DNA sequence: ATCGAGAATCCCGGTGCCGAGGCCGCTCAATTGGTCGTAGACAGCTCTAGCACCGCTTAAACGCACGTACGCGCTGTCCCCCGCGTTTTAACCGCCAAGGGGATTACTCCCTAGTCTCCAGGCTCGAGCTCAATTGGTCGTAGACAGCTCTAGCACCGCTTAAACGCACGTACGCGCTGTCCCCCGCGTTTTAACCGCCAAGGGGATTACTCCCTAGTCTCCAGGCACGTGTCAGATATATACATCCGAT
DNA sequence: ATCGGATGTATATATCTGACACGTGCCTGGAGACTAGGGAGTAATCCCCTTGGCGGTTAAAACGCGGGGGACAGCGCGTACGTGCGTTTAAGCGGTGCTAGAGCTGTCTACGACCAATTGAGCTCGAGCCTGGAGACTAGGGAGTAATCCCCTTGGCGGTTAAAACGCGGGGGACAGCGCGTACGTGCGTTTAAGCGGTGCTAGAGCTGTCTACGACCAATTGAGCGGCCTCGGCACCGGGATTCTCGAT
């Protein structure tokens, strides 16, 4: 995993509070979470990579990711 | 607590994604995108365990979030 | 008298946008299903409106793939859609 | 009627019957079919208000399949919610890109 | 040869929202369907949700958490509201 | 050889309504063979379909049930 | 005042507790065997004639027949297990064709 | 020749007043409950014997019951049994 | 004399076990089994007939008979 | 007219699965009952009560027989019983 | 603590039919289990073969008939010769 | 002894004893239990016949349950006789069906 | 609990190759645990019932050979 | 390396289970199962050892037999595999069912 | 880039008129009111599992500069290639025309649910006798009750074979076609099962007599049962021989 | 197919021991005489009656058989399943050791069941009438079986609009080149990641108990759907106004 355990921890706390008070999380709950951000991520990126080098470029750019965005539908 | 999503844990995330380059505007743009996806997932998430009436969000409710989606 | 190229297409293209007609020719399209589907199995009937169906469904596919495709060129900083469109098109949406 | 009860214009009694036989599980609570007939209703509601509005825009007194894609596309819940979803005859939103003008 | 549909409680929904204004078949019949489908992918969450607690009942719940997570945001919000508000007359 | 009846004015029709404006000669044989593609994998399962019913007639809804599985929903010949 | 009476039966207490006495069981026999016995037997036979009663009034007869006990016997899993080893003559059998039989 | 013809007769009558029975399924019936006495009285002489015993008591009956009908049969039996031996005790 | 169960007569047999179509050998094969079992039965049923220093078979000696082969027969008692 | 192969092989098992009636001729029974007990016994004797109990248990015998052969041939996906089905049929039953 | 049981006699035919064969506990307990049980089968076919013919009274007559009854062919003919010699001793 | 009277190992006096005591009949004749005897005195014999049979088969001077178990199931007349019997610790017959076998 | 589990798959194998079975469908083993299931409880019911006729706490080897002989299965060696 | 053909080693299983005479459930789960369902009948019932044995020899000659006549029911329909339609067909007319 | 002319296309107004939108008659089926057996659903009480949370530690991980060369974006030319109009061509569309398996219909025969007499079939009243209450003891079976001691149960610790789990994979289950058998369906010939009825007598079923043979009670001594002490036969271990399986070839 | 060769099991095989038969010793309780008494199986004998048989009569199943049409036992082919490894935990088993509790045996004492007449009713059997099943019989519906018709599916044969496809020239694609500002690697100072213990506490999961709310089932019903009919909204036609990109002019 690529990501540091517990700002991601505390992140998922800070998002979950705005929806509902007092939650606690089992470990294995925020794992998951955890493996599925990445992979999302990875995806996206590969997407955004066949999207930078559509227009010559190597380097990935927020269009890229916007337009990657775009056609997955979000 | 968004900042804790540091630049170089985003740069090995597109390492594997076989990107070399990255611009400095990329960053910023991914930490929005994983809190949009974290948003909506956490949601279901959340919307299983009310249902449940647990206080505790369970990996179970985590997976059947991803497969809903 | 000549239009400038380009003119007659962004023409057509509001024409387009402001109509709902079906695109491509009936009988064609009818033979093109019927000939699939005998690839599949032999002396197969079809209802109307089954080919009817098939064929809304195809021109919509295929106006939303021309849709992203259209983005794809102009990412590219491009006004015309080709084939390396068309694959990232389908490659993002999750089809190839 | 239960529709008439619960103060609605969707068939309660008929939602229920095709909860009982779409084989979705063996038994049914009675507020569930008042719930998602109540929640069709709202809907329906909302894409013929915005379908009506884009009618009398196009100073038109019938709705057409092109007035519910205008008002499908131009609301953005209505559109995530339809996002994979052809309306028959409905056309695409007028638009061009501003890198193609002269 | 009974083939049922929803067409009349759409006019009449049609007839509270635009008094004045019709339906033609073609549109009536993407309302029908639209209706089927949203039908559908309510009942089966609900379904879904009973199988995943254990239940083997669906009941005003199950139909009220499918639908905050079949709709987005405000029409979500308007939607149970108008559950709720239906399911409160119809128990009294 | 029935892919030729998608002809090239009817792909140049379905580009402008999506807001195509000039057309390389090569994209249309391309966007026959991307049709081409996408009619086997629906007729498929829509004639799956009907085999499971056991009927030799493919109906509009055995169509729409395949769209539906591919995450195409088209609304309106139900 | 008979024992039946007393305890509410119409099966003949003093005559099974007669049979028991001769039917070489056993040495003795209690008072209340008997009675129970009785009992038991009593209560299956209403049930089997309930049963056959109402075949018999589904086939529009105010007399029950073997073929009617053979009805109610079959027809019921516990009474059909009880004589599973049973032959009810005259009682022929079951309507019952194999599904792959049929056209 | 003894036989339970005016008892089954008469439960005919307690169950279906105006129902008859006959000659031949009057002769099952007679059949059933020589069968079924002989098999539960059977059973009890065994348990007794099992267990050393040279009393046949309603507890004998009764866990023959238990062991020669199935289900519903047997509890109603049993319960029948019970309701009878205690009406007749007092 | 086994000869006389006709045909027809064990066709008629299938028939009330629900059988629908049935081979020509079948016939002869159950005449056997059919003499099988009266055999096994009649031997029992003569041997009752015999303690009692008897010589007429009675439906009694057949019905214990059959009851002791686990095929007890109601209604002949 | 005629009808097909099989629907009055139905129509006869419904009819006689629906009465009662005993199946075997009185008289060829009989002859064949006398013959079996000539080989035990000499100088035997017949009720003709123990007559028709012998030939009610032959025919319940083989009623139920008929059917367990049917089971073994509708599971060898065959509607046709054979002898190796009622061999089949009396190995299981244990005779 | 008595316990009678059949074994020292089954050991006693064991000598008889095989002089230099043991047998093993397992199986002494499987040879008692079958005298009492065919014990229980004649036993009780006799019983019921003197209630049949209204006598009260078991003789060597229903231990015959029960034999026949239970015992297969010439398995029946040899315990009945074996009864019947044995019988004609004890009698003399 | 009445054993050695009729010339039998098997006791004749336990078996009248437990004639006596069985409830098999309110009186017991003098020959019953003789008979009785003898016939469970034969069949001993055999199964024992069998058994050592088997067991001298198999090098074995010691029968143990297994050879029990061949001896009865071997003969048709006692597998008949003990049709529905089990025989602890006796196996089964080596027996393939010949269509199993390549 | 679930203790039915505990008859395992290479168990009814090792019991079907004794009955002289060389290939088993996999859907045969829930259904043969089903079929044991049965047969134990009705043997285990009658035992039971003995055991509570003699006024006992504890099922001994008698009481499953009388009800197995009851059934219909006659039990020798254990008496 | 070295391979047996499907059926070899199987029928090598056949003639070594049927030579011999070892049970052939495993002792302890067994107990475990027997203690449970009586326990649905009767709590705090207690067992003898050799009652859990007797009980386990039963069930073990009740399945082996059982397992012979589904045998024979699926070589009869000249197959090779006993399925569940082979045991209820046993059952049935073993008249268990 | 911006001024004017301008023409070709679009928009729009106004209009004949026609085809789906809208609304009623009749039905009838899906809907719903009222009842009941039921149990799944909810509710109530325990606990110890796992997590909220922290006090210290280190140390890879991360934040912050150095510079620095590199891809990203602008910009001039080229080209080649693709829209625009013209003219040409031909398949598309209307429709018109008929034909062919599909088709549900109706068009014919043979049963089955339902009717009309005629009794044999139990149903009812009186005589009867063998059998079911009664009671006062007897004696013995059996239900409380006291100890004891074995044995069923419960826990803990190796450990060792077994069981649970990926990974090929070829064997078999299952399926479709099928040439052929052979099994069923009517017909119509012919016994032969079934019926009426009459007679006889061998044996069954009952009746009374009676005589041998079963039981029970007492004392005995002696065979059988509880232990008991002790080999040696079956269980355990390397040895080894042969007896099946199984891969390259007759 | 049978033949070499190799593995890879099993089968027998000498070698060795401990635990289950085996012969031993001693006790008591149970089979044995035996005597006598009480009582059921045997034996004519008698009546009649049920079942052989006869024997004639008759009509309904059985037989033979020819025809035809529908399973049958292959035969081949697809693919998917169970099996047989090889590996890594789960726990079964034996080892030991406890630790009660319930079979178990023996004691005692009120009670309950078997009788022995002794009575009084429930029941079985014979006439005495009767009354609603069985059979003869009839219209209703099922049944196959064609077999005339709806819905498509090809084929003819034209207007006709739209495709083709050419020529053109107008203009992005795109190539190259160059200038820039910006991530990158790297090295160093720092900070909190991880994470090790280490605590204390709610509630997820579970175990008992009860009841509401639901299927589901029957009995009355009225709302919707289908068809029929009326009617104008829009829909293309046509003519007029505008507008909208296009070219001369700076």
Do not use: W
Request: hydrophobic content about 40%; overall charge positive; proline content about 3%.
């Amino acid at each position: 995993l690529l990501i540091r355990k517990l700002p991601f921890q505390r992140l998922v706390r800070e998002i979950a509070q705005d929806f509902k008070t007092d939650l606690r999380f089992q470990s294995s709950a925020v794992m998951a979470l955890q493996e599925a951000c990445e992979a999302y991520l990875v995806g996206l990126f590969e997407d955004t990579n066949l999207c930078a080098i559509h227009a010559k470029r190597v380097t990935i750019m927020p269009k890229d990711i916007q337009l990657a965005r775009r056609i997955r539908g979000e | 607590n968004i900042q804790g999503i540091t630049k170089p844990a985003i740069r090995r995330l597109a390492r594997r994604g076989g990107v070399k380059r990255i611009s400095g505007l990329i960053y910023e743009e991914t930490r929005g995108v994983l809190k949009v996806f974290l948003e909506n997932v956490i949601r279901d998430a959340v919307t299983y365990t009310e249902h449940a009436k647990r206080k505790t969000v369970t990996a179970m409710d985590v997976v059947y979030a991803l497969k809903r989606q | 008298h000549r239009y400038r190229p380009g003119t007659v297409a962004l023409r057509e293209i509001r024409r387009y946008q402001k109509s709902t007609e079906l695109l491509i020719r009936k009988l064609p399209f009818q033979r093109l299903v019927r000939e699939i589907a005998q690839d599949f199995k032999t002396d197969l009937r079809f209802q109307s409106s089954a080919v009817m169906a098939l064929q809304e469904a195809c021109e919509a596919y295929l106006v939303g793939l021309f849709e992203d495709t259209n983005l794809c060129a102009i990412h590219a900083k491009r006004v015309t859609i080709m084939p390396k469109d068309i694959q990232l098109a389908r490659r993002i949406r999750g089809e190839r | 009627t239960r529709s008439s009860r619960a103060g609605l214009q969707f068939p309660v009694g008929r939602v229920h019957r095709l909860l009982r036989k779409g084989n979705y599980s063996e038994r049914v609570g009675a507020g569930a079919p008042v719930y998602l007939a109540a929640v069709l209703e709202y809907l329906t509601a909302e894409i013929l208000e915005l379908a009506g509005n884009a009618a009398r825009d196009n100073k038109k007194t019938r709705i057409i399949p092109r007035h519910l894609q205008l008002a499908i596309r131009n609301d953005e819940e209505l559109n995530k919610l339809l996002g994979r979803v052809t309306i028959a005859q409905g056309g695409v939103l007028p638009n061009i890109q501003a890198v193609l003008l002269p | 040869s009974r083939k049922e549909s929803y067409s009349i409680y759409v006019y009449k929904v049609l007839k509270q929202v635009h008094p004045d204004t019709g339906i033609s078949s073609k549109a009536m019949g993407i309302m029908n369907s639209f209706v089927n489908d949203i039908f559908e992918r309510i009942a089966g969450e609900a379904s879904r949700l009973a199988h995943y607690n254990k239940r083997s009942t669906i009941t005003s719940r199950e139909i009220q958490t499918a639908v905050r997570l079949l709709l987005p945001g405000e029409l979500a919000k308007h939607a149970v509201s108008e559950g709720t508000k239906a399911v409160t007359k119809y128990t009294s």
